[PDB]
Each structure stands twice: as structure tokens, then as C-alpha cells.
């Protein structure tokens, strides 16, 4: 109620001083009420602060790029002066009375009146209040005495402490004060880690502005305080998962030499090289270097953990986890173990112990994995286990507003929690119907074979799904494995090979290929020895490929079969030629490489062209050159579209440019006139104009005719700029 709110606050208003610094102190201490669920009465406090504001009615300033003058520009053009005297047209005189009388009445304005106005405005105005306290509360700090200011700064940090009891709870109350405190022009004397824990209360990023500001602000109060503020903000930017601040900050905050050197060595992804670099950083940290602080151990510490965490050797990491594991033993529980009781005691230990939903995720995970393993024992608590997602949502509205990559992890798990309950019925009905269904599971299996993450995302992520996939693929085998001898998936759940071959391409991509050996070894003992898994595995073994190549010839001599497709092997044969021509053995390689594609009937065919073109790069004689080029562009004609086929043409266009008036190569080009390049060939086209203008536009006339044919309007506009200029320069 408008009167009930106003009068009750007025009773507090009149029974007060009009002494702002007292009243602000009386605001800052002399009521510290919670009122915690809604809002502050900072509204009423600003009104209480306006209790000390004068009830004046002047309120002016001169900076709006101010308005017109009343009479200056009416006295700045002085030429044709009439300046009439008691001869006023009444339309001038009657109008001059009114607006001046309108000037006499309308401009009535007070400050206290607007103060009354903005108060009732702020009755329903949240974002104005966030503007409001940032307006006044800095200017109040001006009129304040220096000694009590230090006490008020303690009192303000104590005022920071008293709703640090009150769990008020993306709407800003502390953050409303905090950014209002953030631009107070450096009057926060200790509160370095005080803000750091305050950061996760609500609204991170408004705070982190205040923190990075003090680190530039020049104060020597302690080099410890310089080091401490350095530590706390180094957490928070890492806390928001922002990478480049963290590996950025410490490399510009280094003390040891390998500390600087390793920090860059790790953050680029050269993780193995960082470990040795951290190792000598550690051996020198067995030190005479006295002033080492908790970074240099702990930075070296988890670096060993991360290097342990990354590639492999999780058993040795479990061996590291034995006398250890705050939850790394539960991360070692993330390493594959289907011993239900042992995890259960671990889980109940873990469930005993704001981060770690992965706790409750794991707490669901094996419990889900157990419940269906008791074959059609249960699925209902798994639907109760969807409430774990319901807690898991509370994160994705805590700290950010934009898509800071906190999401980029927190989505990846939010993906999985549904994928679990998706699998749950998919598990049980498979346990049901086996007790047609090979196709029906092939739906949800191809679906989960589809819903696979981005190919450059994060090595930990693509691992963690590859883990959770095969554990289901085990139970997928575990139902299929008794039932087919029970009868007597036509032959073999070959499913995890797809998880295998994919991680293989990822591992070559994310660049630690030791685990590519470690995965390919595990592929060995499997059913489904028929052609389909063999055609996958030869595709896997070629992806798995001097000493390594001669072992590939040793792989060629006796391993799996020669009954399968020889084009895959001939690709290895021309790559063995590509290894042979890597030793400059051109002729033995290319003839085999030309025969390798000739059996195959094309990436090798372009590469064998490219090898013969690299042979042409070594041999400026046209004989190798025109022989390669017609083969290579035709191999590029054999090459796939929708790729970097454009650059393959571009070198070929450069090679056609590189002809340097050889002769008869275009007859090889015209005989090997290729199918549709155009939409791919569309980007190099303005260049293709100039060379066709320069020289030898035989197939270029053949090219551009079809090009403009099925590409109007892109041919048009530039050439209208071009060709009108071209003949005008020609004539």
C-alpha cells in the first residue's frame, strides 16, 4: 500500500538526523536488517540519505550541449535594425505575454520533489536502483573523515559480512553494492581473498573488474598483498574456465625458469614436453631457491597429475591415486571397474562427501548401470535419477550470462545425463525382446553413433564419452553374448570399433598418438571376422599407419588377408611408394603408384599426381611435368568435391600458369576434359580471367563457358567491372 509504505518509512525518516556522514554510518551500521529475500531498502536508504539532502529547488547544470539563448542570437545579426517602439503587432505582443507567463508557471521544479518522484519510481524499478547506488554512494565517500573511513572500510567489510550470513539469493543485491563498491576509486584496503570467496556468492564478472583493477593500482602495502591479489584473481579467471588468462598470467608471473618455459610448453598442448620441463622444475625446486611459494609446488603438483590424467597410464595414476585421491580415486572409479560393491562403498563415501555433480552423476551412473544389469530389475529410480539433472541445472544459471565455456563443459555432461536415461529403456527392452530387434536397437545405436561431439573440442571430453560408450557396448555384448549360443547382430557387435576408429582420427588430430597405439592394441580379440569389420579394420589400420613403414611392409607380408579390397592396400602401396619417392626414388614409386590407382579406380591418385608433380617440382623438364599434370588434374577430377579440391585446382592452375609456353600440354588437358568444377572453381575465377587474358585460353574457354552458364550473376558483376575496363585498356 502506497500510504502504508510511505508513512511507515516517513516515521523512520523524520526520526533521524539530516547528517549524511552520520546517516550513512547510520545506514552502514545502525540498522543491519536482513529483509533478505527481496531487495534492500537502499531505496529507503537513499531516501534516508536524501533525508540529509536539502529540499532545494534550483538544481541546474550546463552540459547538455545546452539550449538556445533567449536573446543572444536575437542580438547577433545586427544589420537591418527596425527596433520598433510602441508599434507592436498584437500577435507579437499577446504571444510574448503568454509563453513568458507559461515560462512563469511551468518551470516550477524542486529537488526534493524529484526525490519524492524517483523514490516511488524505485518502488518498482530494479535496474534504476543498480544505476542509483552507483551514482550516489561514491560521492558520499568524499565527505568522510580519514580515520573513521578506515573504520568504515572495516565496517563496510563487516557490512559485507552481515549478509554474508544472510543467504539473500542473477539478481544483484551484493553485486548491486559490489559494483557500486567496485567504482569507489580504490578504497578497499585488505579485501583481496575476501572478494575471491565472495565471487561465487552471486554474479561473478561484476566483481572481477574490481579485482584486476587493484593489481594494476600501485600499492606496495605488501608484496604479499601483491602476491595474494595475484593468486585470487588467478583462481577466478580459471574459475570461470577462461584459459588464456591463466596460462597467460603465471607465465608473466614466473619465478623459476622452467616455470616460465613449461607454462608456454603446456598451454600449446605439448604436454609431454611440459612434464620433463616441469620435472627439472621440480628437481630444481628441491632447492636452494628459498623464496618459492605455494604455486611452484602445486603448479608443479597438478601438472604431474594432469600429465598423469591426460594420455594413459591410469593404473600408474591409480598407483598415484592409492595414497591420494581427494576424489581422484573416484576419478579412478572413472577408470573402468564393474565391481559393484567396491564402488558402492566408494560411492557412499563419495555421496557423503557447489561443484561435483559428477559425484551425483556417478552416483546415478553405476546405480543405473547396476539396475538394468539385474536384467529388467529396475528403471524407476533412474527416472528419479533425472532429478540429478534437476540439481545439475542450478549450475548453468549461477555465474555467467553469456556463453562462457563453463557451459562448454556443463553442456557436455548435460548431454550425457539424458543419453543415460535414453539408454536405460533402450537397455531394458533389449533385455525384454531378446527374452526386428536387431534393427530397432540399430536405430538408437546409430543415433548414439550420430550424436557425437565436435571434432576439435577437448581431449578430455571426447575421451569421457568414448569411455561411457564402450561400457554400454559391454552390456550390449553382455546380452548378445549368451543368447546366440542359446540360439546356436548376425555376427558380432562390432560397434565399439566406431568409437575406436573415431578416437583414432581424433588422436591424430589432437596430436598425442601414443594412445593411438594403445587403442589399436585393444582392438585385437573380437568377433565379426567377416568382411564388414575387416573393411572397417583395414580403414582403421591404414589410419593406424622408415622403421614404421618397413613394419608396414612387414604388416603387408603376413597379416590379416589379401582377399579383401586391394584399393586400400594399393593406397598403402602408393604410400609405400610415397615413402619410396620420399627417398627420391621417383620412378619405382610412381609406376607402382600409377599402378596402385590403376587397380584402385583417388586421394593417392592425386598424391601420386602430387608426387609426380613433386617430381615435376624437382624436374623443371616438362616431360615429367606434363605427364604429372594431366594425370594429377584428372586425378583431381577423380578427387572428391566439397573439400580443399580448390587448392588442388589452384596449384594445377598455378601449374597451368607454370607451363611457361611448353606446348601440347593443353591437348592433354582437352582430352582429359573433366566434369563439373565450377562451383568449387568459382573462387579462383577472377584470376582465371587474367591468365586467359595473358596466355593460352584453350581449355580456359572450355572452362569459363560452362562456368558463366550455370553461374550467372557472380560471373556478371565483376566482369562488368572488368571486361569494360579490359577492352578499353586494349583500345
Amino acid at each position: 500500500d502506497i500510504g502504508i509504505r510511505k508513512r511507515f518509512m516517513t516515521i523512520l525518516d523524520n526520526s533521524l538526523e539530516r547528517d549524511i556522514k552520520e546517516r550513512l554510518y547510520y545506514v552502514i551500521r545502525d540498522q543491519n536488517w536482513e529483509f533478505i529475500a527481496d531487495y534492500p531498502w537502499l531505496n529507503q536508504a537513499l531516501q534516508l540519505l536524501y533525508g540529509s539532502f536539502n529540499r532545494e529547488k534550483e538544481l541546474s547544470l550546463k552540459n547538455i550541449y545546452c539550449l538556445s539563448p533567449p536573446s543572444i542570437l536575437q542580438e547577433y545579426l545586427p544589420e537591418n535594425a527596425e527596433m520598433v517602439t510602441e508599434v507592436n503587432d498584437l500577435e507579437l505582443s499577446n504571444f510574448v505575454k503568454g509563453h513568458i507567463a507559461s515560462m512563469q508557471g511551468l518551470c516550477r521544479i524542486i529537488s526534493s520533489d524529484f526525490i519524492d518522484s524517483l523514490i516511488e519510481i524505485f518502488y518498482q524499478d530494479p535496474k534504476a536502483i543498480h544505476r542509483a547506488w552507483v551514482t550516489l554512494f561514491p560521492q558520499v565517500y568524499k565527505s568522510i573523515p580519514k580515520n573513521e573511513k578506515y573504520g568504515f572500510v572495516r565496517s563496510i567489510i563487516t557490512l559485507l559480512s552481515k549478509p554474508y550470513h544472510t543467504r539473500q539469493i542473477r539478481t544483484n543485491v551484493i553485486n548491486m553494492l559490489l559494483d557500486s563498491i567496485s567504482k569507489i576509486e580504490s578504497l578497499e584496503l585488505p579485501p583481496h581473498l575476501v572478494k575471491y570467496l565472495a565471487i561465487s556468492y552471486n554474479a561473478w564478472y561484476q566483481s572481477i573488474n574490481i579485482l584486476e583493477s587493484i593489481q594494476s593500482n600501485t600499492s606496495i602495502d605488501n608484496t604479499k598483498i601483491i602476491e595474494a591479489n595475484e593468486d585470487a584473481l588467478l583462481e577466478l579467471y580459471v574459475n570461470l574456465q577462461e584459459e588464456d588468462m591463466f596460462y597467460g598470467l603465471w607465465r608473466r608471473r614466473a619465478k623459476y625458469t622452467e616455470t616460465n618455459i613449461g607454462l608456454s610448453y603446456e598451454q600449446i598442448g605439448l604436454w609431454d614436453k611440459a612434464q620433463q620441463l616441469y620435472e627439472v622444475a621440480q628437481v630444481k625446486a628441491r632447492s636452494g631457491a628459498l623464496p618459492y611459494s605455494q604455486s611452484e609446488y602445486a603448479l608443479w603438483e597438478d601438472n604431474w597429475i594432469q600429465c598423469a590424467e591426460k594420455l594413459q597410464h591410469w593404473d600408474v595414476l591409480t598407483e598415484l591415486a592409492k595414497h591420494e585421491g581427494f576424489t581422484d580415486l573416484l576419478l579412478e572409479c572413472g577408470w573402468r571397474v564393474a565391481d559393484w560393491n567396491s564402488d558402492r562403498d566408494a560411492l557412499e563415501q563419495s555421496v557423503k562427501s557447489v561443484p561435483t555433480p559428477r559425484r551425483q552423476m556417478f552416483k546415478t551412473f553405476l546405480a543405473l548401470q547396476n539396475f538394468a544389469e539385474s536384467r529388467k530389475g529396475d528403471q524407476e529410480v533412474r527416472k528419479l535419477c533425472d532429478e540429478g539433472i534437476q540439481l545439475s541445472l542450478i549450475k548453468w544459471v549461477s555465474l555467467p550470462i553469456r556463453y562462457t565455456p563453463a557451459h562448454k563443459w556443463l553442456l557436455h555432461g548435460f548431454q550425457q545425463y539424458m543419453e543415460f536415461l535414453e539408454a536405460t529403456q533402450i537397455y531394458a527392452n533389449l533385455h525384454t525382446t531378446t527374452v526386428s530387434k536387431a534393427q530397432e536397437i540399430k536405430r538408437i545405436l546409430q543415433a548414439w553413433r550420430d550424436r557425437l561431439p565436435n571434432t576439435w573440442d577437448d581431449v578430455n571430453m571426447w575421451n569421457d564419452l568414448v569411455t561411457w560408450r564402450q561400457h554400454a557396448f559391454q552390456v550390449i555384448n553382455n546380452a548378445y553374448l549368451p543368447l546366440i549360443p542359446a540360439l546356436q547382430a548376425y555376427r558380432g557387435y562390432h560397434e565399439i570399433a566406431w568409437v575406436i576408429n573415431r578416437f583414432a582420427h581424433v588422436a591424430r588430430k589432437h596430436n598425442m598418438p601414443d594412445v593411438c597405439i594403445s587403442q589399436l592394441a585393444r582392438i585385437y580379440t573380437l568377433p565379426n571376422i567377416e568382411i564388414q569389420e575387416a573393411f572397417l579394420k583395414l580403414r582403421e589400420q591404414a589410419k593406424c599407419h622408415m622403421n614404421e613403414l618397413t613394419t608396414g611392409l612387414d604388416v603387408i607380408s603376413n597379416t590379416n588377408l589379401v582377399y579383401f579390397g586391394t584399393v586400400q592396400k594399393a593406397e598403402f602401396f602408393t604410400l609405400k611408394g610415397m615413402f619410396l619417392s620420399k627417398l627420391r626414388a621417383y620412378e619405382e614409386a610412381n609406376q607402382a603408384f600409377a599402378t596402385a590407382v590403376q587397380i584402385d579406380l583417388a586421394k593417392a591418385w592425386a598424391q601420386w599426381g602430387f608426387f609426380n608433380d613433386r617430381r615435376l617440382s624437382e624436374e623443371p623438364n616438362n616431360i615429367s611435368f606434363a605427364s604429372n599434370a594431366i594425370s594429377c588434374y584428372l586425378q583431381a577430377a577423380g578427387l572428391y568435391k566439397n573439400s580443399k579440391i580448390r587448392e588442388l585446382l589452384c596449384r594445377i592452375l598455378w601449374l597451368i600458369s607454370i607451363d611457361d609456353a611448353s606446348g601440347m600440354l593443353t591437348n592433354a588437358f582437352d582430352s582429359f576434359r573433366g566434369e563439373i568444377p565450377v562451383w568449387y572453381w568459382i573462387t579462383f575465377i577472377p584470376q582465371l580471367l587474367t591468365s586467359l587474358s595473358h596466355k593460352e585460353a584453350n581449355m580456359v574457354r572450355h572452362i569459363l563457358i560452362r562456368i558463366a552458364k550455370s553461374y550467372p550473376q557472380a560471373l556478371h558483376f565483376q566482369l562488368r567491372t572488368t571486361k569494360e575496363d579490359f577492352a578499353v585498356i586494349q583500345r
Binding site: I2, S52, F53, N54, L59, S60, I64, Y65, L67, S68, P70, S71, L73, Q74, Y76, L77, N80, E82, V84, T85, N88, F95, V96, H99, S102, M103, Q104, C107, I109, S111, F114, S117, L118, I121, D125, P126, A128, R131, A132, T135, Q139, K142, S143, D386, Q390, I394, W396, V397, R402, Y403, H407, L411, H412, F414, Q416, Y417, E419, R451, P453, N454
Partner: protein, 877 residues
């Protein structure tokens, strides 16, 4: 609610047919929007369409809409942007619901909607999900930034609805491979507008060491937000005004000093404005920086801080002080604008490129003048209504303080003119309408001193020109209606005084040439073009002879310069229709268009089947082109000696195409072609070839055997108006048994339960009996044959009190009045036949039959009284 009750029907029994709705269905919505385009509170007509959409699907009636859909979609989307208010967003957004399948055009508003309301959220959540086991792979949907912008903002755990989350997870994690697969580095930093950047005022307080400045008006965003909001407390609303009331006041209240010896000095300036060539002082002087967007930032505050007030005054309960301020604001701001005009007179009389003075660092009411009338093109047309009161009180004070001077013409108008000209050029429905009402109140106080009409002649004409042209079909026609009404009055007061072929110097010469060049685009553009043409030709002397002689030079070339088989014929033969709108003048290039003739022969001889007929819009244009071609071919024969003797009977070859137009079988085409061939063609000659014959005999075999239908019977009916002795009048009696053949009692067995109107044989039978309305006048055997077969049907129909044949009886007794009264006295006994007439005589088409029976009544009142002893039971009958 009736329609809402009607809506629940086929839902309630789906055994009760959607086939009941199915023909009226797809007809309805297309007319509904057509009537919605026509309406005068059309959101009502929109409000029905949702509800009628709101119960369908799962009764397979998909295939009906499969023609209709994109018309709905494209218009809705165009409406969807145009909505620009409140619920019509959400309603059109709710209208995004449809029956399943495709189209990314539907994908465009989805994210606009998937946070446009809480309300819709459940529905479209189903949509993209279902859009996500089939060809639902290749989705390139790149509004995916904003889709990401809403969808993550949707997910919010608290007490939000536990399902609302539960979908959103099942959405997002379903595509994790597509999760950030085009997420972008953030590309809306998007800040520090001058909806935010306030300044400060040197305030004071009771503890303060100095006049401690306090930053006024941070609240502007919310202060805007609170007042315009509907659900305000009146105290809260009044404060939102009262806080704004100090605010934009104080934007010049400190500068609002009342000058003393300026009233004479402005009267001296009035004499100095009465002076001209008032040269300025010798200055090549300095000038500071501006960065006038920062000034425009400060302007856009005072732009918005003003345009708020007019958009607040028209709101109720507080208009009183509002307008008083607004009068007083105009009292201040116009006077300063006069000083600014004098400042713009100091900033005038430059000579050639040498230098000037250019003082800086003030503000003025020029844009403030320029804003709010251009901001009268808004919603809440009371604000548009106060916008009329603006330019009134403007032009009131304009003539009050400067009169009707050319300096007074300099003083107010050209600001308000060129903006209103530019607003007329603008491209929103709601924006454009605010100009047009502004043009009218302008036209009152400008036609007196029409030198501005001399100034804006080819200007304001061109403003009208695009106004009918460019504005899209989203709008109701009232703007387009208000367009031509002022526009005919505009071409009135323009061509009101010069009435000879003598005063034809520059401006109207340039203006009419555009009007000639406009005549070729939209039919609604084309239609009032001629109406403005033939009326402006009608008065002020020079007719369509003289005016379209200049156009005869202008239309001698593009009648053949942009050739046929291209240059789409609707506008193109609209120019020939403009030449048909010039054919009422003597010279319309009235011969030698054999290129126009022979190509148009091939344009009609383009076959409607097995030809360029595999590629509803193509249907409507092929309706439009064939109608335009059939009109232009018929007008070519009807044109004076253009094709009357050219190649002999070009009309008969056009009648052969008109026979092919009869086989084209569109009723709307056939009504135009019959009325054109009746009302504009007159040929009485011979076409005895198989062209008449293969139309004549197979059409009756089509009706009798192939049952084809309502156009087919109406074709030979209009042929019976045309081809005298469409021979063997007994063929209709053979059609009558053929009508009896198509009306076997299986349709009566089909009639057990079903509506008889829906009986397509009865639909055939109504058309069959429509034909014998204008049979050759030996309809004596009609009296014997049909009337028994009608009654024998009717008892087999078990029908009474309402007939299919209410009109075919009504025409036949009109035409045959002598055997009418003959057989009526000859059937004087039987009551059932008598009542059949007694209903039909009550039907009002035959009128002489009634007075004839009014003559025969006193004869029959005797004759039955004579017949009194006959039967004693039928006598009682």
C-alpha cells in the same frame, strides 16, 4: 462462439466428417484473410483463425491445405514483421502452429517467438524437437545465434515448471554434436546508448562541504518503461510523468529565460526577415569539433524524452496538464524555432564556397520540431489525433507569428514538408499512414498559398506515386483508400487553375509524364491510375486525347520495345489496358499493332494442358494473364478498325479463343469472357468448322456421359446465348433423360443422411436446369417433361417447403408465361402441383406471371367454384 461451437464439431465425432468441413474449409481461411485484409477490426477475424486452427490434426485433412499453405505463410510472416501491437505478435506467433508435412520461413519467427512469450514456449518446443529418424539431417538453421540466445536464457532452475526445464534439457543434449557447432564469439557487446548516458546537476545537502553534484535522471530506461506500461498505479503513473515532467523541462528549463527586448528585436527580425539578401559578417573564423552523434545522443534523449510526452498525453486520466504543457512547450519551442530561423538566417546568405562564420555549441528545437509530427506515425491513434492538433497549432502559430509570408513559408513548412515527403517515401505500414493524415491537414492550409504546391509539385506527386505503388498488401486498404482521396484532391488543386494546353511548362509536365510512365505494376495501382487519369482529363480542358498524345509518344515504343514472351503481361497489357484506357480517346495507336496482335494470338494459343503447365500463385497469374489477354484480344477487335477489317474477322479467331476460353472452364474467367463478348462484342458471322463442332457436341457428351461440369454446362449455356441454334433442341430433352440418368436413386440412397446441397448430381441438376432457363422459346415440352420429373424427384426426395429449383422454375415461367397460365388452369385440380407454383409464384423473378395469375384468379375462383361438385374430397383439397 457460434463458430467456436461450430469448430468443435468434427472433433467431437470424427466419424462426423471433416469432409463436411473439407470444401468449406480451405475456402474459408483464404477468404477470411481476404476479408481480414478488407476488415475494419480485423484482429477479430484473425482471432477466429487461431481457434479454427486450434482443433485439427489426426484427422487426415492435410491434403486440402497443401495448395493453400504458402499464401498463409508468406503473408503471416510479412504480417509478423509488420506487427511492429502487443498480442498480435503472440497471436501471429501462435498462428505459427500448423498441420504437419517444407519451410525455413517458418523457422524465422520461431526464435522470435520462443522468447516472445512465456505462453508459446511449450508449443515450439515440440516443433524443433519434432523437426529434429528421417531426412531431418541437413538442417542449416542459421539464426542459430539468437536461437542460442533464447534457449539458454530459457533454461532456468528455481521453481520454474519442472517440465519446462525437462523439455529444454531433452532438447539441448539431444544435439551435443550440434551444441556449440556454430556457436560464435560474442557479437553483441552492444552498450552505452543515450538511453543510458545521463549527466549531473550541482545538488546540495545538509552535510555537505560544497554544492555536491548529483547525477540526475538515471531512471530514464525504467522511467520510460513504467509510464508506457499499461498496468500502472495512477500515483505510479503520475510520478512517471512527474519525474519526466521536471526532466525534459530541465533539458532547457535552465536555458528557458524570457528575453525582454527581443520581442521588438524579433519584430525587427521580422522586418529583417522581410528583408532578404541579408549578408553576413566577414569571417573565415574558427570552429570546434562536434561529434554530433554525441549531440545526437543528447538529442536522442531529448528526442525520446519529448516523444514520450505526446505518447503520454493521449493516454487518459492525465491529458489535462499534459496538453497545457504541450501548448506551453509549443509556445516556447516554436518561438525559439523562429529565433533559430533567424539563426538560420544568420546561417544564410552564403555566396560561393569562400567561408562563413558558423558559431557553435548550442541546442535548438529544430529536430524537436522534426520529431513528434514524424512520431505521429505511431500506434494509439489518439496520439495520431493529437498529431493533427500539432500541425494545426503549428500552422496556427505559424501564421500567428509570421503570417502568410514566404518567410513564413520559409518558417514552418519545409521542415514538416520534406519529412512528410520522406515519411511518404518510407517503408513501414504504420509509419506510412502517419504521413498521409499529415498530408491532408497540410493540404487544407497549403492550397491557399500553393507556391509550396508549386514547390512540391513533382515532389508530392511522386510521393503519392510510390505510396499506392510500393506499400504492400499487409495493410488494410484504408491507407490506400485515404491515399487516392487526398490524391485526386491533390491533382485537383494542382490542375484546378491551368486548364489549357498552354500552361504546360515544367512541373506538371514532369509530373504527368511519371503518371503516364506509372500506367504500366499493381492492378490497384493500375486502377486508380486511370481514375486519376480520366478524371483529370475530364476537367481542366485537355482530355485523354491531349494527355495521352504525350503518352502516345511515350507509349509508342514500349508497346513493342520490351517484347512479349517476357515483360510480364499484367502490367504489360495493362499498358494496352491503359491503351484500352486510351481507346476511349480517338487515338490509342489504333492500328498497326499486329506484333501486339499476332503474339497475343500465340499468347492465348499457348495451351493450358500438356504445355507450359507443369511448374496457387501460378494459377492466379495464369488466370490474370489469360483474362488480360482475353480482354486485350477482345478490345483489339472492338477497337475502331484496329482488327475489325485487319485480317478480316480477328474477332472470330478471338471467338475461337473465346471458345477455347469456354473450354478453359473457369467461371470467373467465363463471366468476364461472356460479359465482354456480350457487352463489348457484336459479331454476327459464321464459324461452321469443327472449331464450333468439337466444342458443341463433345461438351454435351461430357455432361451426359463424363458428367462434365458446372462450368461445362455453363459454357454451352453461354454458347446458347451466343451461338444461335445450338441445334437439336431435343438434345436438352435428351440431356433431361441424361440428367435423369445422372440422378438415379443411388444418389437418393446417398441422400440418406447427407445434405442434398452436397449432392453433386443435385449440384449438376441445378446447373442442368439453369441451362434450360434460356432454351429456345419452344419450351412447351419443358412444361410436360421436367415438372413431373421434378415432383417425382421431390416425393422421392421426400422434400417440401424448399426446392433446389427455386430459380429454374422462376426463369422458365418468366420466359414461358403463356403455357404457364395455360397449364395452371389446365392443372386446376391437384394441390401438390398448385403449391409448387404457390411457392414459385411467391418467388419473385417472373412478375408478369403473377399479374397474369392475378387476372386468372377471378377466373379460377369461379372455375373451382364451378368445379365444386366434382370429388367432395379433392374438392375439400
Amino acid at each position: 462462439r457460434l463458430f467456436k461451437l461450430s469448430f468443435m464439431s468434427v472433433n467431437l465425432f470424427p466419424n462426423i466428417n471433416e469432409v463436411v468441413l473439407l470444401p468449406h474449409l480451405n475456402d474459408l481461411i483464404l477468404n477470411s484473410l481476404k476479408y481480414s485484409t478488407t476488415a475494419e477490426e480485423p484482429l477479430v477475424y484473425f482471432y477466429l483463425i487461431r481457434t479454427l486452427f486450434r482443433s485439427i490434426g489426426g484427422g487426415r485433412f492435410e491434403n486440402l491445405y497443401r495448395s493453400i499453405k504458402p499464401i498463409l505463410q508468406v503473408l503471416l510472416q510479412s504480417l509478423n514483421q509488420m506487427i511492429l501491437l502487443p498480442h498480435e505478435r503472440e497471436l501471429y506467433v501462435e498462428l505459427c502452429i500448423t498441420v504437419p508435412v517444407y519451410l525455413p520461413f517458418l523457422m524465422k519467427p520461431l526464435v522470435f517467438a520462443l522468447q516472445q512469450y512465456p505462453d508459446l514456449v511449450s508449443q515450439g518446443l515440440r516443433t524443433l524437437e519434432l523437426c529434429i529418424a528421417e531426412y531431418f539431417d541437413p538442417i542449416i538453421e542459421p539464426v542459430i545465434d539468437d536461437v542460442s540466445k533464447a534457449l539458454f536464457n530459457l533454461l532456468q532452475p528455481q521453481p520454474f515448471n519442472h517440465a519446462i526445464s525437462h523439455n529444454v534439457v531433452r532438447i539441448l543434449g539431444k544435439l551435443g554434436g550440434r551444441n556449440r557447432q556454430f556457436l560464435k564469439p560474442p557479437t553483441d557487446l552492444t552498450e552505452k546508448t543515450e538511453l543510458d548516458i545521463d549527466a549531473i546537476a550541482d545538488f546540495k545537502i545538509n552535510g555537505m562541504p560544497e554544492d555536491v553534484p548529483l547525477s540526475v535522471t538515471p531512471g530514464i530506461q525504467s522511467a520510460l518503461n513504467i509510464l508506457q506500461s499499461y498496468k500502472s498505479d495512477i500515483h505510479y503513473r503520475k510520478s512517471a510523468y512527474k519525474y519526466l515532467t521536471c526532466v525534459l523541462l530541465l533539458m532547457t528549463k535552465s536555458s528557458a529565460e524570457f528575453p525582454t527586448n527581443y520581442t521588438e528585436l524579433l519584430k525587427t527580425a521580422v522586418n529583417s526577415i522581410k528583408l532578404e539578401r541579408i549578408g553576413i559578417e566577414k569571417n573565415f573564423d574558427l570552429e570546434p569539433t562536434v561529434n554530433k552523434r554525441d549531440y545526437s545522443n543528447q538529442e536522442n534523449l531529448f528526442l525520446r524524452l519529448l516523444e514520450s510526452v505526446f505518447y503520454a498525453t493521449s493516454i487518459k486520466e492525465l491529458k489535462d496538464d499534459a496538453m497545457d504543457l504541450l501548448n506551453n512547450l509549443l509556445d516556447h519551442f516554436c518561438l525559439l524555432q523562429v529565433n533559430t530561423t533567424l539563426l538560420n538566417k544568420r546561417n544564410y546568405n552564403g555566396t560561393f564556397n569562400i567561408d562563413l562564420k558558423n558559431p557553435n555549441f548550442m541546442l535548438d528545437s529544430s529536430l524537436i520540431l522534426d520529431a513528434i509530427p514524424f512520431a505521429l506515425s505511431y500506434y494509439i491513434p489518439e496520439v495520431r489525433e493529437v498529431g493533427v492538433l500539432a500541425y494545426k497549432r503549428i500552422y496556427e502559430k505559424s501564421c500567428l507569428i509570421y503570417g502568410e509570408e514566404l518567410a513564413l513559408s520559409h518558417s514552418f513548412i519545409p521542415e514538416l514538408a520534406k519529412q512528410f515527403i520522406h515519411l511518404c517515401y518510407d517503408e513501414t505500414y504504420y509509419n506510412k499512414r502517419g504521413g498521409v493524415l499529415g498530408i491532408k491537414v497540410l493540404i487544407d492550409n497549403v492550397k491557399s498559398s500553393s507556391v509550396f504546391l508549386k514547390k512540391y509539385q513533382y515532389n508530392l506527386a511522386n510521393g503519392l506515386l510510390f505510396v499506392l505503388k510500393d506499400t504492400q498488401s499487409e495493410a488494410p486498404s484504408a491507407i490506400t483508400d485515404s491515399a487516392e482521396k487526398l490524391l485526386i484532391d491533390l491533382l485537383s488543386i494542382t490542375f484546378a487553375d491551368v486548364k489549357e494546353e498552354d500552361l504546360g511548362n515544367k512541373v506538371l509536365e514532369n509530373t504527368l509524364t511519371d503518371i503516364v510512365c506509372e500506367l504500366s505494376a499493381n492492378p490497384k495501382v493500375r486502377n486508380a491510375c486511370q481514375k486519376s487519369l480520366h478524371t483529370i482529363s475530364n476537367l481542366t480542358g485537355i482530355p485523354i486525347v491531349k494527355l495521352m498524345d504525350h503518352s502516345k509518344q511515350f507509349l509508342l515504343s514500349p508497346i513493342f520495345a520490351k517484347p512479349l514472351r517476357a515483360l510480364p503481361f499484367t502490367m504489360q497489357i495493362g499498358n494496352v489496358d491503359a491503351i484500352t484506357f486510351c481507346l476511349s480517346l480517338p487515338n490509342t495507336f489504333l492500328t498497326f499493332n499486329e506484333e501486339l496482335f499476332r503474339l497475343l494470338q500465340e499468347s492465348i494459343v499457348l495451351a493450358d494442358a500438356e504445355d507450359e503447365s507443369l511448374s496457387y500463385s501460378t494459377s492466379e497469374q495464369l488466370v490474370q494473364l489469360r483474362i488480360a489477354c482475353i480482354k486485350l484480344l477482345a478490345i483489339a477487335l472492338k477497337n475502331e478498325e484496329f482488327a475489325t477489317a485487319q485480317q478480316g474477322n480477328i474477332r472470330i479467331r478471338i471467338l475461337a479463343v473465346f471458345f477455347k476460353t469456354m473450354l478453359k472452364t473457369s467461371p470467373e474467367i467465363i463471366n468476364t469472357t461472356y460479359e465482354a463478348l456480350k457487352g463489348s462484342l457484336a459479331e454476327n458471322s459464321k464459324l461452321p468448322k469443327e472449331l464450333l463442332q468439337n466444342g458443341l457436341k463433345p461438351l454435351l457428351m461430357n455432361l451426359s456421359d463424363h458428367q462434365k461440369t458446372v462450368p461445362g454446362l455453363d459454357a454451352l449455356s453461354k454458347l446458347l446465348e451466343l451461338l444461335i441454334a445450338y441445334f437439336k433442341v431435343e438434345i436438352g430433352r435428351k440431356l433431361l433423360d441424361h440428367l435423369t440418368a445422372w440422378c438415379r436413386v443411388e444418389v437418393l440412397d446417398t441422400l440418406f443422411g447427407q445434405d442434398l446441397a452436397e449432392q453433386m448430381p443435385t449440384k449438376i441438376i441445378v446447373s442442368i436446369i439453369n441451362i434450360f432457363h434460356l432454351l429456345p422459346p419452344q419450351a412447351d415440352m419443358f412444361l410436360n417433361d421436367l415438372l413431373l420429373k421434378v415432383m417425382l424427384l421431390e416425393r422421392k426426395l421426400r422434400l417440401q417447403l424448399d426446392s433446389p429449383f427455386r430459380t429454374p422454375l422462376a426463369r422458365y415461367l418468366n420466359r414461358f408465361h403463356n403455357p404457364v397460365t395455360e397449364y395452371f388452369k389446365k392443372n386446376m385440380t391437384l394441390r401438390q402441383l398448385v403449391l409448387f407454383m404457390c411457392n414459385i409464384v411467391q418467388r419473385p423473378e417472373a412478375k408478369e406471371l403473377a399479374e397474369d395469375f392475378e387476372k386468372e384468379l377471378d377466373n379460377f375462383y369461379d372455375f373451382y367454384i364451378s368445379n365444386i361438385p366434382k370429388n367432395q374430397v379433392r374438392v375439400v383439397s
